[PDB]
Each structure stands twice: as C-alpha cells, then as structure tokens.
C-alpha cells in the first residue's frame, strides 16, 4: 500500500506556562515514531520498533541536530513577527516528508505555516517556493537565492526521505504492513416519523484507510450521505460509518483490496 514519512515542527513564541517553545515529531503513516521538544532537549523514539532498531548514536546525533533546528525556528519566527509587525504569541510550523505509493511512484513535500495558515510551499520540480502573501514573498526570494540548498532539498525529498521511509517500514513491518479487516454492520431505524435512517458502521480495522458508501438498486449512488470520521479506537484499530435516509439499499465497503456488500 501507500506509506509515508514526515517530520513536523511547531514553534511557539512567548508561550504560556506549560507549552514548549518548540516541539518536533516524526510519523510513519499514522504512527508517531520520534519526539523532541525544547523542555527535554532530547530526541526519543515513540515506537518500540524504532527504539529496538536504531542504536544510541542515532538519538545522540539527532539530539544535536534538533537543538540546532530549534534555534533556527526561534529566530525565523522572530523575523516573521517583525515582518508582520506582530506582537504576542504566534506559531510557526513546518511539515516535511515523502510517500512511497502502491504503484511505486513517489511524492515529496515541504511546507511552512504561520499561525496555522499556509505560508510557503516548496515545489521540488521547479525548485521554487510558493508564497501566500508579500511577507512570504520576502522569505521566498531569500530562499530561492541559494541554488545549492534547493538542490539539496530536492535530493532529500526524493532520495533520502524515501530511503528512510523504506528502512522504517521494514523495522515496523509487523505493525505497518499488517491487515485487520473491518467488522461491518448495518442498522435500521425509523427516526422522525416517516423518516428511516440507515447506518453502515465499521470498526476494528487496520490500516485506517477505508472506503464506505451507499448504493441504490446496485447501480446509482445515493445522494445525501453523511460521513463519520475515521476514529482511532485506542487499541491500534479504527472505526467509521456512513449513513442515509421504495427500492433496495446496500452499503459497500472496501478495505485493503477486499470488497464487501451489506444489503438491506
């Protein structure tokens, strides 16, 4: 299937009591794998298959790198506040990563946000930064001036990030590449008088990616379907649902290459 690796950074200026100035967290798919923050000042694993397969050298080296990157975020955030003429507490975020698609193709992304809004989006195909406003444009020009760093970034998204992802994917295969099929049921109920509600409910499945829909007479898809979020159940699996309100209805579910139909 499609897997992904990504590293987030959150910087907060003038934080209240109890909020780190800086937090950085890594994920493989939906699973946290690493954590660092300005309070512990240490990078630690957040999955046991990460802890077991990476020697102390790794955590030691990246602890030093993250301290440096923490300092880098702090100063960048100061400059952005200056550009906007902002005071008080603001936030600064970035997301870097890559995906290895099921058909073997790849993607790579690198994005920044100021106060929770898109700010700069890197296009690794033209080696350029997309800016949302004039302040981002100011930063863009600075970053686009350094040709070699743009080349380094493209190489990191396309080659390094993908090789890290394959490495981590192997380490955690018993978790990441397993399949737990959905338990799926349909519930019927007359609600408001005259109104009958159909709910198609799935739970216990992994990976979280699941497709659910309602069909009428096997052909057309029903209009006005309500969708429920894919929610973590807390035991490593997920749950979700889809619902609608004198012909024949059926719920269709696809999960990890297996298709399921529940007729009413």
């Amino acid at each position, epitope marked *: 299937r499609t897997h992904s690796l990504r590293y987030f950074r959150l910087g907060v200026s003038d934080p209240i009591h109890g909020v780190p100035e800086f937090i950085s967290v890594g994920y493989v798919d939906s699973h946290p794998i690493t954590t660092y923050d300005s309070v512990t000042r240490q990078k630690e694993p957040r999955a046991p298959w990460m802890a077991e397969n990476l020697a102390p050298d790794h955590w030691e080296r990246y602890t030093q790198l993250l301290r440096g990157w923490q300092q880098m975020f702090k100063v960048e955030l100061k400059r952005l506040q200056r550009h906007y003429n902002h005071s008080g507490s603001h936030t600064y975020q970035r997301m870097i990563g890559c995906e290895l698609l099921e058909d073997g193709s790849t993607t790579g992304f690198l994005q920044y946000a100021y106060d929770g809004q898109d700010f700069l989006i890197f296009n690794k195909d033209t080696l350029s930064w997309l800016a949302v406003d004039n302040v981002a444009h100011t930063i863009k020009q600075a970053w686009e001036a350094n040709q*070699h*760093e743009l080349l380094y970034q493209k190489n990191w998204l396309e080659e390094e990030c993908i*090789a890290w992802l394959k490495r981590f994917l192997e380490y955690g295969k018993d978790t990441l590449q397993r399949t737990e099929p959905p338990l799926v049921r349909v519930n019927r109920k007359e609600t408001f008088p005259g109104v009958t509600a159909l709910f198609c409910k799935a739970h216990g499945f992994y990976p979280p990616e699941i497709y659910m829909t309602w069909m009428k007479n096997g052909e057309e898809i029903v209009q006005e379907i309500d969708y429920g979020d894919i929610l973590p159940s807390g035991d490593g699996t997920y749950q979700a649902w889809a619902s609608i309100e004198s012909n024949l209805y059926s719920c269709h579910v696809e999960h990890s290459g297996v298709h399921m139909v529940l007729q009413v």
Partner: antibody, heavy 109, light 114 residues
Framework: GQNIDQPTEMTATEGAIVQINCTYQ??????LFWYQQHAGEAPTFLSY??LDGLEEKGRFSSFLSRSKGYSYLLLKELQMKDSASYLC??????????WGAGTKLIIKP | GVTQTPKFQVLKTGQSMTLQCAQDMNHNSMYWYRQDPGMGLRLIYYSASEGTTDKGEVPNGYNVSRLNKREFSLRLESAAPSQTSVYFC??????????????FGEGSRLTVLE
C-alpha cells in the same frame, strides 16, 4: 557512512588538463564537497554537488554521478599556482562530513 | 572570517593548553578538527548551535567550551605526544543543511614533547 577514496597524488603538465576522482561508499548521501588546500594554508571551499551533472566555476568544474557514486574535480589550463591538495568530503544521511585523505596535485612546468 | 590562535605552540607532556577560535559571521555551528599526514580531517568536537556541544570522532584527550555564539575553545587538559598535530577550527551557518560549506581558521601547529 564508511569511506571516501581519492588518489594520494596526481601529477600533470602545466597548461594541460587533470581530473581528480573521488568515489564514496556512505550510509546515505546529502552532497559531495571539494576543498582546495595550499601547503601550510587552510582549506577553502571549491564546490558542492548533490544531483547528477557538471557544474563549472571558472577553470574548475565538478561532476557528480549518484548512481556510480563518484565525483571528479576537473581543472583546465593548469597553472603552477594550482599546486595544492584537493580534499573530497561527503555529507552522509546524518549530515556528518566524511573526509577523503586528499589528493596532492603536482604541476610540471 | 574565522580567527584562531595560537599559530604555533610547543608543549611539554602533561601541560594544559587552550586553543581559541572566534567567528564573526554569525554562524551557528563550529568545529574543531585535527589534520594528520596520510588521513582525512578528523572531527574532535563540534557545536551545532549556541548552547550545545558534542563529541566527534576523536574526542579523547580533549574537551570544548562553546562560550557564546562567536567562540568555540578547545582544551588539551593534559597534553600528550600523540596530540602533536595541526588543528583547524571551522564554522558553518548551520548544521543539517546539505549545501552549507565550512569556513576554516588558519590552523594551529601544536608540538608536544617529553
């Protein structure tokens, strides 16, 4: 990573061409640098390659092949003043610099 | 760019010694290297930014102080003959960026004698 190899010494003739090879076998790759170091002097940055291709900077060019894992530093129209050691170094996947033992270039007038 | 001292120093075995390095380029990262005939540069200690330092490849016999953003001093607590070498301080804008190059100091020639 683990190792970087470049020849110990090369000798060419003034006015001609010399190519200095650097191969690397590293745990990941975040770019290859060349440095120039005159005898008794500090090393100074010459070039950086991280994608495939050839980058020219005056009489010097530097090439990288990612798939064959090697670089060369190309010096055209050699001058006596080009006599120096040339240092190859790769950044590995953890951004640690791994250094070649350097190539001493000797120019024959 | 990078100023380091002293250019030359003779030490008796067991003596203390501090090498100073300063950079006014507002760089965040600094390094101490030794250079010995027949091998590549070897990292002794480094400082990725102000307020953190760590061992490099050959930290034994040495320690360092990242005094402030500008200054990274190298200390030989008890000089030994094998520490006879050429020492280079270097800095870079950051660490963890692929293309950032090093800027080297002029070197310190250290000779440790019994």
């Amino acid at each position: 990573g683990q190792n970087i190899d470049q020849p110990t010494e090369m000798t060419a003739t003034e006015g001609a061409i010399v190519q200095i090879n650097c191969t690397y076998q590293t745990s990941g790759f975040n770019g290859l640098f060349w440095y120039q170091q005159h005898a008794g002097e500090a090393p100074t940055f010459l070039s950086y390659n991280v994608l495939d291709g050839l980058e020219e900077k005056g009489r010097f060019s530097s090439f990288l092949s990612r798939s064959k894992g090697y670089s060369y530093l190309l010096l055209k129209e050699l001058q006596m003043k080009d006599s120096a050691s040339y240092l190859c170094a790769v950044k590995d996947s953890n951004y640690q610099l791994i250094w070649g033992a350097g190539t001493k270039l000797i120019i024959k007038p | 760019g990078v100023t380091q001292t002293p250019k030359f120093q003779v030490l008796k075995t067991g003596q203390s010694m501090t090498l100073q390095c300063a950079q006014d380029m507002n760089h965040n990262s600094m390094y101490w290297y030794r250079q010995d005939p027949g091998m590549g540069l070897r990292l002794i200690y480094y400082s990725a930014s102000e307020g953190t330092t760590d061992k490099g490849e050959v930290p034994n016999g040495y320690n360092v102080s990242r005094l402030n953003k500008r200054e990274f001093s190298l200390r030989l607590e008890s000089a030994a003959p094998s520490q006879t070498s050429v020492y280079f301080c270097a800095s870079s804008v950051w660490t963890g960026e692929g293309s950032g190059e090093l800027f080297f100091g002029e070197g310190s020639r250290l000779t440790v004698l019994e």
